[PDB]
Amino acid sequence: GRLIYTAGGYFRQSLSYLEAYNPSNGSWLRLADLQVPRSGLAGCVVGGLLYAVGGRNNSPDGNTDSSALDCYNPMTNQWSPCASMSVPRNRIGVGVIDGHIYAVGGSHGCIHHSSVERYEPERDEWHLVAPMLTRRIGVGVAVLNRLLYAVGGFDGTNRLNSAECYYPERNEWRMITPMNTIRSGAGVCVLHNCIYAAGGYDGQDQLNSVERYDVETETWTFVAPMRHHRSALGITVHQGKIYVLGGYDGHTFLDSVECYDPDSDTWSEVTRMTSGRSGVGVAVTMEPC
Ligand SMILES: O=C(O)c1cnn(-c2ccccc2)c1C1CC1
């Protein structure tokens, strides 16, 4: 697409912001608020529509985990409700395969989900699939070669360096090589043939380290670290580069947006969000009207 969309997030309370960043010219646009404030959600794009999935409304009025799926049409600049998931999923991960959205893990109160469900836009309907082998909240999710990966997170008792892979034609989950680092609330994405895991929380510290999984060799290798330690960051890929957005560094809710160039193995700061925040959902699609 053309723009990096950031939805929701958290600073003092859950937020309703939708804003879109244009890497070509450095500009930010403020777009139509989410109907319901939510942090800990995930964003993804199917057929040019942007989707916001799950999360939680942390508010003075109270705290409500979200089963919601909402859809934003850049042409109209309007949000519409879509079918809700079977269960609320705060701190969810999502991935898209063959036009279908997979919702993975997340929490509902003290329940840490291993369950997974799949949305079909053509029918506006969700169906459960096989659960992960591990309960995971704050899980990173990415798709590569039409396989779905769940990376890290928190199972209820321990933060995790473990990861696993879902094979749709077999409806089966299998463990892959674990990361070299425990990461909960990291940013996970795909670039070229590798699954990237940036930042997160290892139980004691927010991380600036980044590592990547080569599906051919099944090994994790560290690359250059981010300039800022971050957990609960947003992440996405745009024209061959990874962008990380916001997060919490142990002291400040970050407005920093960093960009990773894999040919030079360097990060640089490319812009700042209009306000520091963590727990955003991020995806890339066309510019609005
Ligand atoms: O502390 C954890 O283990 C954990 C689990 N999920 N998330 C999270 C993930 C996304 C958004 C907000 C929070 C966290 C904290 C960010 C570290």
Swiss-Prot record:
Q: Which one GO biological process term can you cite for this protein?
A: regulation of autophagy
What keywords appear on the UniProt entry?
Cytoplasm, Kelch repeat, Nucleus, Repeat, S-nitrosylation, Thioether bond, Ubl conjugation, Ubl conjugation pathway
UniProt-reported outcome of changing R56M: Impaired interaction with NFE2L2/NRF2
Gene ablation phenotype (knockout): Early postnatal lethality caused by abnormal cornification. Mice survive until weaning and probably die from malnutrition resulting from hyperkeratosis in the esophagus and forestomach that cause gastric obstruction. Defects are caused by constitutive activation Nfe2l2/Nrf2, leading to constitutive expression of phase 2 detoxifying enzymes. Mice lacking both Nfe2l2/Nrf2 and Keap1 reverse the hyperkeratosis phenotype and are healthy and viable in normal conditions.
What outcome follows a substitution of R91M?
Answer: Impaired interaction with NFE2L2/NRF2
Modification after translation (UniProt): Non-enzymatic covalent modifications of reactive cysteines by electrophile metabolites inactivate the BCR(KEAP1) complex. Accumulation of fumarate promotes the formation of cysteine S-succination (S-(2-succinyl)cysteine), leading to inactivate the BCR(KEAP1) complex and promote NFE2L2/NRF2 nuclear accumulation and activation. Nitric oxide-dependent 8-Nitro-cGMP formation promotes cysteine guanylation (S-cGMP-cysteine), leading to NFE2L2/NRF2 nuclear accumulation and activation.
Instruction: List residues modified as S-cGMP-cysteine.
Output: C110
> What are the cysteine partners in each disulfide bond?
none
Phenotype upon changing S278A: Impaired interaction with SQSTM1/p62
Record localization: Cytoplasm; Nucleus
* Stated consequence of mutating R159M: Impaired interaction with NFE2L2/NRF2
Please name the GO terms that the record assigns under molecular function: disordered domain specific binding; identical protein binding; RNA polymerase II-specific DNA-binding transcription factor binding; transcription regulator inhibitor activity; ubiquitin-like ligase-substrate adaptor activity
Keyword Transmembrane present in the record's keywords: the answer is no
Variant or mutagenesis effect after changing S231A: Impaired interaction with SQSTM1/p62
Q: What does the entry note on its domains?
A: The Kelch repeats mediate interaction with NFE2L2/NRF2, BPTF and PGAM5. KEAP1 contains reactive cysteine residues that act as sensors for endogenously produced and exogenously encountered small molecules, which react with sulfhydryl groups and modify the cysteine sensors, leading to impair ability of the BCR(KEAP1) complex to ubiquitinate target proteins.
Summary of subunit composition and partner proteins: Component of the BCR(KEAP1) E3 ubiquitin ligase complex, at least composed of 2 molecules of CUL3, 2 molecules of KEAP1, and RBX1. Interacts with NFE2L2/NRF2; the interaction is direct. Forms a ternary complex with NFE2L2/NRF2 and PGAM5. Interacts with (phosphorylated) SQSTM1/p62; the interaction is direct and inactivates the BCR(KEAP1) complex by sequestering it in inclusion bodies, promoting its degradation. Interacts with NFE2L1. Interacts with BPTF and PTMA. Interacts with MAP1LC3B. Interacts indirectly with ENC1. Interacts with SESN1 and SESN2. Interacts with HSP90AA1 and HSP90AB1.
Q: What does this protein do?
A: Substrate-specific adapter of a BCR (BTB-CUL3-RBX1) E3 ubiquitin ligase complex that regulates the response to oxidative stress by targeting NFE2L2/NRF2 for ubiquitination. KEAP1 acts as a key sensor of oxidative and electrophilic stress: in normal conditions, the BCR(KEAP1) complex mediates ubiquitination and degradation of NFE2L2/NRF2, a transcription factor regulating expression of many cytoprotective genes.
Protein name, as recorded: Kelch-like ECH-associated protein 1
Q: Taxonomic lineage of this organism?
A: Eukaryota, Metazoa, Chordata, Craniata, Vertebrata
Q: Which gene encodes it?
A: Keap1
Span of the entire protein shown here: 325 to 613 of 624
